[PDB]
Design a protein around this ligand. Structure first.
Ligand code: HEM
Ligand code: MTN
Ligand code: MTN
Ligand code: CAM
Ligand code: K
Length: 403
């Protein structure tokens, strides 16, 4: 715990540790939701992780993500060392500088790309699920949640499958550091990997996402190698450590809730709406911003260079946005959330994400309608910039499945 800065009033202190939250045994969303109990102010200072602000409510989270002039994305990760070294494109750039790079990224992950990739997504999902189906069990995290989205990404990026273990390791250090590498070291090693590949595909372009990004136009000129590198690196992080975690929270839920499963079994057309509700309830991202100036925000005095965590996860969990937030209701009339961010840096990968999520649920519920958590397994979660599931052993009766 870092010493309380003089400008922070004592009543605002709430020592939440985003990488190791107190109530994690209750579930990661539950752990973070302690920030929304009535004894916690809308904006608190934690002395954890070097010390930083945390907005706990949708209203503030959205406002802050909209006001980039006060809350710059130049340093979007806690701790400070990580935000300092963070230089991915487009995320580390404030408007309007980021727009040109978002456009370029949309050429590799935008809706049109996702629609043309849907056949491979379905293919891979079906193949993996059918391989699992007669077995009557799986380790969900390593048997599906990882290889499915990750292989689609590697296919899109035209990168070798044998590189997955190295890259997945590196991306996880940036989001959930185990202590072996600082964010800066993880980033530089990912850059080490990408540099020669980017040079080769600028010399001899293929048709893959890296070739497209590394040879695109920004700002009336060719993209530089350095920009290409910083953009491709963020695309790797997106591809390897988002949907990978989210599918496990969803499948854990569905394993544990036969009644919700039955809903989607009986009425498969609901799966898209259900997916969005799962996106709210099992939201998993938490980054933020850095103060560009002294600023009074909702009667709280913030100083230039204060960091503020703005957990995208919390907005949809806020009972001010959704009545009975912890309860899953597929029928929920307005599913309010900021699971995919807010403002100028809205997730670019969210169409790929949704398609992967919806393809997975529809195919799994068709082939393996009835499944459960393996006997006496206790599911443990993990927290960080992106939260996750440690392990998800699942079982089912192969005679109940359909080939
Ligand atoms: C469940 C899946 C996903 C979630 C929850 C998620 C979440 C988010 C969030 C919260 C942000 C805003 C970050 C900020 O403002 O600092 C963001 C931006 C971004 N996401 Fe995703 N994402 C997902 C899938 C993906 C995928 C699969 C990719 C890559 C294919 C991706 C690529 C990106 C990129 C490149 C940005 C930066 C956009 C910009 O800075 O203009 N996302 N995402
Ligand atoms: S109103 C929620 C709440 C906060 C705190 C004061 C910690 N509590 O004891 C309850 C659970 C009443
Ligand atoms: S903690 C073990 C370790 C440290 C570092 C030098 C970053 N590594 O490459 C490994 C993961 C072996
Ligand atoms: C916070 C994110 C999910 C978003 C895309 C990947 C990620 C870890 C970032 O650095 C920006
Ligand atoms: K930075």
């Amino acid at each position: 715990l870092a010493p309380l800065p003089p400008h922070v009033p004592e009543h605002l202190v709430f020592d939440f540790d985003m990488y190791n939250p107190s109530n994690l045994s209750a579930g990661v969303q539950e752990a973070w939701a302690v920030l929304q109990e009535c004894n916690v102010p809308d904006l608190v200072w934690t002395r954890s992780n070097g010390g930083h602000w945390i907005a706990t409510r949708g209203q503030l989270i959205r406002e802050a993500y909209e006001d980039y002039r006060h809350f710059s994305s130049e340093s979007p990760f806690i701790p400070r060392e990580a935000g300092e070294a963070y230089d991915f494109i487009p995320t580390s750039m404030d408007p309007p500088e980021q727009r040109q790079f978002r456009a370029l990224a949309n050429q590799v992950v935008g809706m049109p790309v996702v629609d043309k990739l849907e056949n491979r997504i379905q293919e891979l999902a079906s193949s993996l699920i059918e391989s699992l189906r007669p077995q009557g069990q799986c380790n969900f995290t390593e048997d599906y949640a990882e290889p499915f989205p990750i292989r689609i990404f590697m296919l899109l990026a035209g990168l070798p499958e044998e590189d997955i273990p190295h890259l997945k390791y590196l991306t996880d250090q940036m989001t959930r550091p185990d202590g072996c590498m600082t964010f800066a070291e993880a980033k530089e090693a990912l850059y080490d990997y990408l540099i020669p590949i980017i040079e080769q595909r600028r010399q001899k372009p293929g048709t893959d996402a890296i070739s497209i990004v590394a040879n695109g136009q920004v700002n009336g000129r060719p993209i530089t190698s350095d920009e290409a590198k910083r953009m491709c690196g963020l695309l790797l992080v997106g591809g390897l450590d988002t949907v990978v975690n989210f599918l496990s929270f969803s499948m854990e839920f569905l394993a544990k809730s036969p009644e919700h499963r039955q809903e989607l079994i009986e009425r498969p057309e609901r799966i898209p709406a259900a997916s969005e509700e799962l996106l709210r309830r099992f939201s998993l991202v938490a980054d933020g911003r850095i103060l560009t100036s002294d600023y009074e925000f909702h009667g709280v005095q913030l100083k230039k260079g204060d960091q503020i965590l703005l957990p995208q996860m919390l907005s949809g969990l806020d009972e001010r946005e959704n009545a009975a937030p912890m309860h899953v209701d597929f029928s929920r009339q307005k599913v309010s959330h900021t699971t995919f961010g807010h403002g100028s840096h809205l997730c670019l990968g969210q169409h790929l994400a949704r398609r992967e999520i919806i393809v997975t649920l529809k195919e799994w519920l068709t082939r393996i309608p009835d499944f459960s958590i393996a006997p006496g397994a206790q599911i443990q979660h993990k927290s960080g910039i992106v939260s996750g599931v440690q392990a998800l052993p699942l079982v089912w009766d192969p005679a109940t499945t359909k080939a």
